[PDB]
């Protein structure tokens, strides 16, 4: 069910990476420290791409209106965002980064 | 700036656009039709918050700021053009040349040291297609073509239009005009029914974000704009449903029009073809002040001779102007006004909840923020 | 935070009350009469600064915020209820359900990811005594009885009244009605003579601070208010003197009215008995915005059968409304407006020079400050 | 105090003047004519932003602030003077004495402890030359003469005038009046032709400004003002030229007027002689609020006996009022209104570009800044504030 | 009746205020500033507030209603909106007992 996002080496701590899925909505993968997290890429408050936002700690800020989400829980962290973000299964297997379906 | 810094910091995708409440400085803007200003008859107007005076001398147009350098009164309160080339303030008689705005005389103190040492602000003015454009900017102006939609200036393009003051910030007018899903407000248009036009209620987008629009960063003339391509991979919606049951339908006309829609800086929309297969509509939303704009509408049609231009002129006055420019577009006017409150405190630029078809508007906001020639500020208007 | 902090710090006795310029949130408020809204005919109104929409579906009332989630336009600009359970925004057809405000459909794009994920704010609505009460608040609403004055919801109590918009902050209205001495303004009233009423130029203190004012915060019904026992502890003043010389006299009548008066949160006054010894008047001062309020006045006479209604209604409509509600209370309207300037900059809350009779009002400010269910702010109105 | 410090820092030479948006406190100001206030008929007015009430009792005038101490309503909403010497608030009946403003009674609570322990603000009022002056200040007032232009109070000087409310800040009016080049706006006035006046398009500065401008701060009665001696030191410009060609000429009548103009604190202009060689015009620009002023116009003519005074009253009504006060000054009204936008946010004081003819106005700004008796503020209007 | 017995000096802690009710008269407020005692009318001259229910800072009593204030020693206004001075009543300590004048100081 999983799909290789990239080598854990490719992502530097505190960076974001957009993951496109065939016939499916895009996902965003963030690396906080040495751990990986994944959520929908599209902001729930609009049509912005969170992968083009700013990641501070475990909080991702939307580039459109400044809303924010906790990348771990997917919960809103700053207005105008109020609708929880979908979170996906992430796991590193032999240096490689993998993501699956929504948990 | 013009907006709370807290808000500007939030809209990282297009802060300059949100800050541009008064419009973009250093661009050309149409403000009236040529036949509206006659020889030796100065006309007043407000553009980008600045009061201006326009006069026609020996057939050529000249533009001076309508504000005396002395005590800041509007010269137009009582116009006094005592010689063909000058205008004299009605208060203490400071006199300026229309050509370069230089203070050339002071009737009440002929030997003042200020004479020849002060200058009233002047702006370039150019006439094209029967329209009067003013370059509200500083330094030498770029070609007018840079700030006009493609084909507007074509040799055979016959241009006829209408202008009026609408009560909404210019940006709300721009966005409504380029809004792919706003066509819903025109579902009961008489024009659509009578002219038998195909008009869906909206579009179910197809393809990726990038395919939704076509951004133009530079024609050889330097124009900047965005084309709405939602119809290239999208599915037109003709039946509106609620809970799975039909409650409304679109127009099933046989005539297909408006398959080419683009918005260009400083803020002019081009719809082609419209309202008929052989015509085009170009409309500007010119900033007057933060709450108002000129809704400068024009319809173009290629004409090869005086006969065709005559016929076009006829159908324009009897059909197109009343049925299209007024009948069809009147709904756009109240739609614009309806968004005023939400955006008046600048909060709407943060609280709006956009959906798929708004990709077009997002592209425009980014293009405008990245390629505008300057942000008009209160300092430009007054400023100490 | 609706007031300068430097001012709130000065009024340590009732800062929340001074800050509640927009009213208290999380309380029930009467906005109109049931008879005013028919089946399937939505109506607009502004409450606590929020534009709202109310509709009656299958006899039941529903309340939705009158502001589309998309571009923030008022849905009421052009009402489009395409199914009995929904309302469709006239702009881009976002459709919401009246019962939960959920965005269930979008005619312009049936495949939007926003569908079923967004929700328009809704407010609890309840009818009673022929009155429409809206719970402008969040979470589960308490019983309507908690925000009603004693005996208002009596099974036999026939409540009838009228409503209108008055240009003054709601608090000025509250402190004009619950003022023992303001009756001086009614000294030449018609209701007084044409109803042989006994009314002194004013009610002065007699016992002591506590004695006359009875604070209520132990009621099991939830009620929170204050009584000013004018008839049981107050002293009537029928002879007004200047320098010892009598210059004005009160009204001598046999009918004994108004010996019991109380103000209750969120802002309703109870004058008992009034306008007749067998009647009772209940009137709300509903905040619309910081400058206006609904003057929701009702007159109620007990009844225990379908009869004595057409009589009480023929009476209420023949003499009570035109003499007790209009003829008498109209003086209160311009008195409220006369206080606007002094309090407009919030400085009147600091500079006012109160006297004995204002003992009751002060009790109300303190109670209202400690028992209100929340302070409405511009943050609730727009965002942030 | 009333203007952003950033703006005040840019007008350092006359900052207080620019700050005095509401006018100068502690000066006498005319607000109406004696004949406009009759015995026992209270009249309302707003001066320096404060709502006041004036009444005539036993022939003498009294002024009380029109704001009840209780809930701050205007007593004038419904005037109730129950006894010859008092006024009762229509709301809760608090009663005040006109003589000292003391709260002497409360009809709704005769035993209140506030009675005799509170007092409504009062201001000195006095009548002179048929005009009602109010000292909008605190403490014992100075002599009225200090705040009046020379000769206005002379024994044989008969004073007649007109008053109205104009929509502009008082200073824009002052600088419209005390301006030697602005008369260009009056070139077509009926007064010019009809009264055969010699009036140039404007008076330009002469060879020496030190002689044309005369600052007066050593007057025995203490008046402070500035003279622009246009007639004896200025240059009358009768031929208006553009590019050296005459496009407009002044009036070559025989009557010589406007030999000198002078502006005096708190804000009164004297034009001499005007509108006729044997008359003088004295006009005040009284601050009502930051956006409004009373344009209090008076014409003075020395009359040596009853016959002359009567002839003057008749000529004033039939000729001087309509031909001069209205026919000449009406254009000053829209001229003043035309300057509002530029000075609205106080930026005009920094952005204006003055010329040589404005040198006396600048001297006035400096004098006003130095000799005014106090800057009125919004705090004075709402209630002074202070923390221990 | 000339002097009214208030309480023992020890009964009041420094910086506290005690209201003294009088039948047929207006209440008084006794303040203990350090080791000294002062008295004024208890009713704020600007309204109907009880100064004894206010905040005492040094020798200045701040009214709880609008924030006006007075100097407890002189009775003079210390902060707006107060403008009318408070009546002051002499106080004396005898036998470690606090007494307050029945009549306010005449000034
Ligand atoms: C479809 C058909 C016509 C129009 C449109 C979309 N968008 C427009 C904007 C302005 C004027 C006309 C139109
Ligand atoms: C005292 C006496 C009568 C009234 C009052 C206070 N407040 C009122 C409000 C409405 C109607 C009557 C009254
Ligand atoms: C110069 C000459 C005459 C006048 C003036 C300045 N200012 C004035 C104001 C009122 C009436 C006349 C004048
Ligand atoms: S689209 Fe992300 S905060 Fe609005
Ligand atoms: S304001 Fe124009 S010449 Fe003075
Ligand atoms: S503003 Fe209501 S659907 Fe767009
Ligand atoms: S407002 Fe004047 S007595 Fe109450
Ligand atoms: S009651 Fe004490 S300051 Fe107002
Ligand atoms: Fe449209
Ligand atoms: Fe009342
Ligand atoms: Fe003038």
Automatic annotation (TrEMBL), chain D:
Keywords: 2Fe-2S, Iron, Iron-sulfur, Metal-binding, Oxidoreductase
Residues binding Mg(2+) 3: 252
Residue ranges of every copy of the Rieske domain listed in the record: 28-134
Residues holding [2Fe-2S] cluster: 68, 70-71, 89, 92, 94
Top-rank lineage group of the source organism: Bacteria
Residue sites binding Mg(2+) 1 per the record: 99
Molecular function GO labels: 2 iron, 2 sulfur cluster binding; metal ion binding; oxidoreductase activity
PROSITE patterns: RIESKE
InterPro entries found in the cross-reference section: Cholesterol_7-desaturase, Homotrim_ring_OHase_catalytic, Rieske_2Fe-2S, Rieske_2Fe-2S_sf
Pfam families named among the record's database cross-references: Aromatic_hydrox (PF11723), Rieske (PF00355)
Keyword Metal-binding applies: yes
Sequence positions that bind Fe(3+): 182, 186, 332
Chain positions recorded as Fe(2+) binding sites: 182, 186, 332
Record bears the keyword 4Fe-4S: no
Residues the record lists as binding Mg(2+) 2: 196, 252
Protein name: Terminal oxygenase component of carbazole
Gene source species: Janthinobacterium sp. (strain J3)
